[PDB]
Symmetry: D2
Subunit: 115 residues, 4 copies
């Protein structure tokens, strides 16, 4: 189905965690901190931390290509979930299923190596 | 600062709530339910409910132009917040500060009236 | 895999409605998006102005034809496509009148 | 107020680096985005292929020049702008190599 996609630019809060599923598929998890502009001065504002995940090869590349602090351009779709019941109440979580990710060449360089 | 914007299409979970601030400014709140495609059949999947808010005039127009069920195209920026402390723990909320919103002409018509 | 974009702007003129030889409806129109420029506390101004032509099909274009006219403010979500010289247009997925400076009485099908 | 878009694709060829008469660096390149087509359980295929030319300035274009070459897969975030006949290009805000089929050793400034 897909729908509702977003593009976010920010830095990894920590190194990408690459763990393997029993089926052989790799999963790369990382949260992206997107910290805004400035003015007059210059003031960092708001900030948005989004939990991301990517699989297969893309996941492995990511794991051995990015580290904590890396500024990246992320594209993917937004996924939400909700909780409940009469003894406590309503909780909401959200994540991004990354379609593509790359380190930003805004404040850095990098020598790419296709396979 | 801005940054991280999104565009979502969906239906209002309920009529837009228009309340007035003591300062005279109007606030329009509404949550958008974005329910996905299908196939083979046809299966509604995932679903994403996003709390939106718009002010000033745009807010008032919205309030007297849209109702529960209305299919709309929303554009704006994503805003997140986080909670905490040693007796309970971590909670996260998110909202969209609408820049522009309009009813969709995908499954309907509407006669617009500029002011 | 398509490249999607969202654009806000006004209709260069009344939407053009036609019918392919098969019967399918087709509406062509162009949106003029005018930018932001500032100085903040020293007067803002509008930008270069971007003109993107849009196409919409089936029962949706029939809705555009019926609701939108010249100079209407609209928000468009679609996919960039380039023709065959060779221009870049937008195949509309969703479109509706912006409620920024206007109200509207919607009517479901 | 600008119209922003995100595009994935490969570099039509090595990036073109030049310097305005003032000294500012400028990199021009074009991204070829190739779509998705399917049948699901009956073989998928790629689409029409969109070609958008991109420009990037200052110390960022100097980074593009140094990291990207012909055929590299990249993800671009920018703003649509139309020139003066009259074409539509993308003024890049951020760009980096897609890690879909490749790794990379980044190096902060």
């Amino acid at each position: 189905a897909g729908d509702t996609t977003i593009t976010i630019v920010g830095n990894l809060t920590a190194d990408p965690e690459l763990r393997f599923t029993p089926s052989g598929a790799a999963v790369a998890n990382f949260t992206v901190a997107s910290t805004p502009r400035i003015y007059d001065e210059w003031k960092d504002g708001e900030a948005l931390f989004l939990r991301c995940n990517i699989w297969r090869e893309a996941a492995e590349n990511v794991a051995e290509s990015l580290t904590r602090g890396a500024r990246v351009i992320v594209s993917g779709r937004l996924k939400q979930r909700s909780f409940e019941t009469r003894e406590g109440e309503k909780r909401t979580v959200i994540e991004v299923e990354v379609d593509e990710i790359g380190p930003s060449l805004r404040y850095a360089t990098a020598k790419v190596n296709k396979a």
